[PDB]
Amino acid sequence: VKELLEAGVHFGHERKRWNPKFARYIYAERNGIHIIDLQKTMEELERTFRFIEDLAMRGGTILFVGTKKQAQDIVRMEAERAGMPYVNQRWLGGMLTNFKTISQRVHRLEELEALFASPEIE
RNA sequence: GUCGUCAGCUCGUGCCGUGAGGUGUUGGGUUAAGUCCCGCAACGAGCGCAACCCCCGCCGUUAGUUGCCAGCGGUUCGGC
Ligand SMILES: [Mg+2]
Ligand SMILES: [Mg+2]
Ligand SMILES: [Mg+2]
Ligand SMILES: [Mg+2]
Ligand SMILES: [Mg+2]
Ligand SMILES: [Mg+2]
Ligand SMILES: [Mg+2]
Ligand SMILES: [Mg+2]
Ligand SMILES: [Mg+2]
Ligand SMILES: [Mg+2]
Ligand SMILES: [Mg+2]
Ligand SMILES: [Mg+2]
Ligand SMILES: [Mg+2]
């Protein structure tokens, strides 16, 4: 399943913009485009998903991030539909690094959520 | 007093740099303005700018020893 699916319309990409390090994953270069190794991808998702899995069964919170347009909503949906945090909008200096301060804003959205639904606009 | 009512000066954390330091405050648009929008490795905050105070312009409320025949009556015909 996870095999032929990806093997389908989901393989290879780009051309002449690449770290030679990522090259250990490329199978070939047909049509001038890098043909990523299909199999090598599956082999990886194995170790990955094992961590994805273990990480969830711990109850641990994953932060999703995809500011790129071709995935903006594709994050939104899947993260909400998982109770997990995500950011498809523009990222921010200190999201994690300067947490407490960025968080001050979250709290500010709580404060604003008060008056956004309270009889105090008399 | 003054530069100068100029729109500026700077702080917290993060990030950047061996460091002095940088970012933010820059950049596009906007305004009397670091005014505001937009963007952004910064996110936000403080002293400034504005706004809250006084005068002048229109109008209503309350007050009728100023003004008023607007309105009638008397007039030494002066709102006496
Ligand atoms: Mg949880
Ligand atoms: Mg209400
Ligand atoms: Mg109220
Ligand atoms: Mg100066
Ligand atoms: Mg400066
Ligand atoms: Mg500076
Ligand atoms: Mg420019
Ligand atoms: Mg300001
Ligand atoms: Mg009047
Ligand atoms: Mg008369
Ligand atoms: Mg008469
Ligand atoms: Mg008459
Ligand atoms: Mg009288």
From Swiss-Prot:
<comment type="subunit">
    <text>Part of the 30S ribosomal subunit. Contacts protein S8.</text>
</comment>
<comment type="similarity">
    <text>Belongs to the universal ribosomal protein uS2 family.</text>
</comment>
<protein>
    <recommendedName>
        <fullName>Small ribosomal subunit protein uS2</fullName>
    </recommendedName>
</protein>
<comment type="function">
    <text>Spans the head-body hinge region of the 30S subunit. Is loosely associated with the 30S subunit.</text>
</comment>
